[PDB]
């Protein structure tokens, strides 16, 4: 099974993520299970950083 990304971290891909990366300087991930989105900036998502 694939585990949720920890709080303050975001999945590297919108679907079928392979690694979890920390939110960069100046960003913050409130919720766990954050994931990046290709649309818009590559460092943010609907719940991402």
């Amino acid at each position: 099974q694939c585990t949720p990304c920890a709080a303050g971290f975001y999945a590297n891909a919108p679907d079928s993520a392979t690694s979890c990366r920390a939110c960069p300087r100046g960003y913050y991930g409130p919720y766990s299970g954050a994931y990046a989105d290709n649309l818009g900036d590559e460092f943010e998502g609907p719940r991402g950083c």
Partner: peptide, 25 residues
């Protein structure tokens, strides 16, 4: 004969990574 028991759950998940003008004449 009775059926065998169920296997023990896997170990805990891993943690997370770290961080002056001149005077007049």
């Amino acid at each position: 004969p009775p059926p065998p028991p169920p296997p023990p759950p896997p170990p805990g998940t891993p943690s997370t990574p770290d961080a002056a003008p001149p005077p007049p004449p």
